[PDB]
Amino acid sequence: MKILVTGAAGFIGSHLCQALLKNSAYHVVGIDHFIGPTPATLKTGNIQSLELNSRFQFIREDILNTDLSKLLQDIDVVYHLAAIPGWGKDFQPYVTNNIMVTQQLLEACKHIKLDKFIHISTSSVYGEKSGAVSEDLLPIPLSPYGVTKLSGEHLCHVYHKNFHIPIVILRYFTVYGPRQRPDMAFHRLIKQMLEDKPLTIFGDGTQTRDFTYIDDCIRGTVAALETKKNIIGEVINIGGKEQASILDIISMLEKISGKSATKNFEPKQTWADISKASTLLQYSPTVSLSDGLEAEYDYIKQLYKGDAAWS
Amino acid sequence: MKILVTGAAGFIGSHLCQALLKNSAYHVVGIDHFIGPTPATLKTGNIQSLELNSRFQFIREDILNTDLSKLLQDIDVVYHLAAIPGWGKDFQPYVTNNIMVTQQLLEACKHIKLDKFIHISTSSVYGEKSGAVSEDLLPIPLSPYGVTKLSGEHLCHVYHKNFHIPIVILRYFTVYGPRQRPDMAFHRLIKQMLEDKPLTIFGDGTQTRDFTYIDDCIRGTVAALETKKNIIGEVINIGGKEQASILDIISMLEKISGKSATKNFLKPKQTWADISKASTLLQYSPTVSLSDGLEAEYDYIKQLYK
Ligand SMILES: NC(=O)c1ccc[n+]([C@@H]2O[C@H](COP(=O)([O-])OP(=O)(O)OC[C@H]3O[C@@H](n4cnc5c(N)ncnc54)[C@H](O)[C@@H]3O)[C@@H](O)[C@H]2O)c1
Numbered sequence: 378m379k380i381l382v383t384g385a386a387g388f389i390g391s392h393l394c395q396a397l398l399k400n401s402a403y404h405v406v407g408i409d410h411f412i413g414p415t416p417a418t419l420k421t422g423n424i425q426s427l428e429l430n431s432r433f434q435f436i437r438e439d440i441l442n443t444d445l446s447k448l449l450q451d452i453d454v455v456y457h458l459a460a461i462p463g464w465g466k467d468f469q470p471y472v473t474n475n476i477m478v479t480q481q482l483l484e485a486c487k488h489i490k491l492d493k494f495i496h497i498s499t500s501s502v503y504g505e506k507s508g509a510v511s512e513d514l515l516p517i518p519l520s521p522y523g524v525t526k527l528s529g530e531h532l533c534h535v536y537h538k539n540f541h542i543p544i545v546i547l548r549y550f551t552v553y554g555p556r557q558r559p560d561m562a563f564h565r566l567i568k569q570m571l572e573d574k575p576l577t578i579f580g581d582g583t584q585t586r587d588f589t590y591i592d593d594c595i596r597g598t599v600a601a602l603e604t605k606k607n608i609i610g611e612v613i614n615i616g617g618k619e620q621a622s623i624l625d626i627i628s629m630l631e632k633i634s635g636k637s638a639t640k641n642f643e644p645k646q647t648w649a650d651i652s653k654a655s656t657l658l659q660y661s662p663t664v665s666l667s668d669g670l671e672a673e674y675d676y677i678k679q680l681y682k683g684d685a686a687w688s
Numbered sequence: 689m690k691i692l693v694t695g696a697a698g699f700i701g702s703h704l705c706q707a708l709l710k711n712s713a714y715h716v717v718g719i720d721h722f723i724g725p726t727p728a729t730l731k732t733g734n735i736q737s738l739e740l741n742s743r744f745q746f747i748r749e750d751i752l753n754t755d756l757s758k759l760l761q762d763i764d765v766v767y768h769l770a771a772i773p774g775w776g777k778d779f780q781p782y783v784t785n786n787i788m789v790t791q792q793l794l795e796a797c798k799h800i801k802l803d804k805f806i807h808i809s810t811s812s813v814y815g816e817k818s819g820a821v822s823e824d825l826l827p828i829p830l831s832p833y834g835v836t837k838l839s840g841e842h843l844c845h846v847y848h849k850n851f852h853i854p855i856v857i858l859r860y861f862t863v864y865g866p867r868q869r870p871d872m873a874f875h876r877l878i879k880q881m882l883e884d885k886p887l888t889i890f891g892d893g894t895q896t897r898d899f900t901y902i903d904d905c906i907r908g909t910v911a912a913l914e915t916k917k918n919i920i921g922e923v924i925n926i927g928g929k930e931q932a933s934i935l936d937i938i939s940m941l942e943k944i945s946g947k948s949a950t951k952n953f954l955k956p957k958q959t960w961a962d963i964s965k966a967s968t969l970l971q972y973s974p975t976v977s978l979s980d981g982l983e984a985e986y987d988y989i990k991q992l993y994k
């Protein structure tokens with residue numbers, strides 16, 4: 378079996394490619410152009426181990442400036458994770474990389490026999506919801522990111538209905554752990570704690586949110602390929618084991634580091650409904666925040682203060 | 689009050705400029721780049737009346753290639769109708785004119801004190817539905833037009849929530865009447881009947897749908913401005929008086945023309961707009977009958993292709 382992962386040098390793509398290659402039957406092609414919020418310097422480390430694997434092929438090209446028929450020959454499964462995640466005149470890159478990229482990939486998949494086109498989307502499509510967020514909820518995105526990613530999902534349905542591209546949509550809720558993007562909250566809090574600085578906190582930080590450890594996110598993503606259920610056409614939430622406030626997270630980080638944080642200071646309560654994923658994917662997130670945060674803490678320590686080839 | 693109408697030379701925008709200018713209090717600025725399926729001459733035809741009026745200013749420029757800070761200086765209300773109606777390389781124009789236009793327009797309005805930004809959208813955002821279509825249904829667009837128009841609506845919510853742009857979304861169901869675009873079904877059917885050619889139907893023509901006469905469309909669009917109720921942030925379906933199938937419509941066109949048509953069939957049975965919300969918030973009640981509306985369109989099409 379041969380699998381294309383778009384955005385394979387990114388946070389989630391780099392872990393997915395590695396989880397796929399544990400199956401000695403799987404061959405992976407990753408494509409990544411090294412753009413978006415993570416600098417290329419920091420990003421190179423994400424694929425260090427990946428490029429040691431003989432069954433991994435890496436292409437450093439823009440999806441919009443590459444031979445797609447060539448990239449897609451002999452591909453059984455596409456995992457599409459390439460995106461600009463996380464305004465003004467900054468808007469064009471979101472349209473180019475979240476809408477035009479998805480449309481051009483889907484166009485090139487018409488002339489191709491895929492088992493699955495697994496399109497990765499985001500909980501930012503939903504906008505604001507108190508309580509359980511389920512896949513039947515009317516999406517009202519409140520960011521440019523959310524708007525352009527939801528547009529990507531809608532193109533998946535257009536190409537499924539019109540040309541029978543076997544699309545699956547996974548909506549990831551906040552994913553954290555080793556390799557988390559530097560623009561994301563846990564990375565920023567941990568780097569501030571390591572540097573004895575004030576921890577930036579927007580609002581009073583008691584609002585509780587859903588968080589998914591990378592390894593739980595990746596098990597759910599792999600199960601989208603390996604499930605015996607018919608999931609073609611479905612939208613599936615992939616969300617976390619435990620929910621926590623930004624003040625709970627800092628509590629657990631102070632326990633981890635044995636430091637104390639100079640805190641520098643919107644539904645109260647929201648979580649992913651993961652019942653569709655439980656039923657269709659046997660998905661069950663198993664990693665605790667305390668284990669997950671320890672692993673992210675050690676990663677960020679080594680990233681900025683260490684001497685690894687990926688420092 | 690000074691009102692910017694985008695797409696002001698188009699089918700609906702030209703009628704809208706006409707109705708607003710009836711109010712002596714209202715000054716109207718129209719911008720239109722003369723693109724999409726309608727030829728330029730028909731659009732010059734659409735605004736021939738408006739240009740004579742001293743409270744009307746017209747700009748023939750791309751919204752993406754104009755000084756929007758100049759354009760919006762003393763504007764109290766935006767009516768945003770500018771758009772491209774409905775693969776591979778033909779996709780960028782939908783993204784440019786339905787997504788980027790809306791984003792740049794909203795960006796230019798972010799820091800201005802508008803009373804209202806009235807964003808015009810489409811029932812094509814809903815995708816395939818059976819029965820009454822209300823604003824709470826999950827939109828699953830099936831076309832690039834639908835996706836790009838749906839993205840425009842979502843940009844409005846982004847700018848409402850973050851910058852308090854006072855947005856109102858109207859979802860038009862199919863609009864017909866004089867100046868209907870030449871790509872649209874009634875325009876095409878009437879033209880074919882005038883030439884005694886077969887009337888081309890796609891499908892078996894028995895699916896009944898919602899049609900809105902342009903004057904009823906404009907009355908609801910003006911009510912979105914003039915209503916005493918707070919409708920900021922609301923999505924409102926604007927739909928029509930009578931439901932008809934294309935076979936119902938052709939039978940009425942036969943009554944107008946006094947002759948039987950040859951019917952040419954090439955390649956979801958019942959669907960209508962739920963206009964409850966528009967009734968309550970806009971006192972919208974469409975009053976023009978299909979037979980009266982089709983007569984008005986028929987006369988407009990005949991004067992073109994005599
Ligand atoms: N990190 C999260 O918590 C989270 C949450 C919700 C959804 N997601 C989604 O998961 C996916 C991966 O997110 P991430 O956090 O790993 O992001 P990331 O930025 O680390 O990875 C995205 C990668 O896509 C690549 N890319 C973008 N445009 C490209 C193009 N035109 N051609 C080739 N490569 C291109 C970038 O170089 C980058 O390496 C995205 O689709 C994102 O929207 C992530």
Ligand SMILES: NC(=O)c1ccc[n+]([C@@H]2O[C@H](COP(=O)([O-])OP(=O)(O)OC[C@H]3O[C@@H](n4cnc5c(N)ncnc54)[C@H](O)[C@@H]3O)[C@@H](O)[C@H]2O)c1
Nearest residue numbers: 695698699700720721722723750751769770771810860863
């Ligand atoms: N006609 C219908 O039945 C119908 C149905 C539902 C919704 N709508 C919506 O109503 C609005 C008007 O539709 P219409 O039938 O009058 O179409 P139209 O093509 O007659 O009018 C739209 C006008 O927008 C202008 N325009 C497009 N892009 C522009 C740009 N970048 N800069 C400047 N001007 C630009 C075009 O030149 C055109 O004259 C659209 O937003 C459409 O999606 C119409």
